[PDB]
Every structure is written in C-alpha cells, then in structure tokens.
C-alpha cells in the first residue's frame, strides 16, 4: 500500500500527477527533467528516490 501526496514535489500545485512507485511523492510530468511527454509504461522511480538509492551505495 501507499499514501501519495496531493501536490507536486517541485511546484507544490495539484493537477495531473505522476505517482512515484517507491515513495509518497508525486510530480507533474512537465516538472521533471526532462519534461515527460508520456506516462512511463512500467515502474517509475522519482528523482528523490534515485538520489536516496545512490546515497545508500556511497555510504555502504
């Protein structure tokens, strides 16, 4: 289960929000880098989760 936020992690506004598959964060497709022109088909891991994974490795 997961409880996702109602506002974009970048701009803090609501609307069409892509939900991260690994945390509660959500993002507008246009608030990502690069702005997404499609909704990913499979698993999508947000920038903050990507950073978290990286940090665990750099410390392990």
């Amino acid at each position: 289960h997961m409880i996702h936020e109602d506002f974009c992690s970048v701009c803090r506004k609501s609307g069409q929000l892509l939900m991260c598959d690994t945390c509660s964060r959500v993002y507008h497709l246009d608030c990502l880098d690069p702005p997404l022109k499609t909704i990913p088909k499979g698993m999508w891991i947000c920038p903050r989760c990507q950073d978290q994974m990286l940090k665990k490795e750099e410390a392990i």
């Binding site: 996702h4 109602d6 506004k13 609501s14 609307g15 892509l18 939900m19 598959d21 909704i39 698993m43």
Partner: peptide, 10 residues
C-alpha cells in the same frame, strides 16, 4: 507507472 488527477482549491 500511474497518474492521478487531483484538484485542490484556490
């Protein structure tokens, strides 16, 4: 991945 439509008030 999935999206949702949410409309918070202004």
């Amino acid at each position: 991945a999935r999206t949702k439509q949410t409309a918070r008030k202004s």
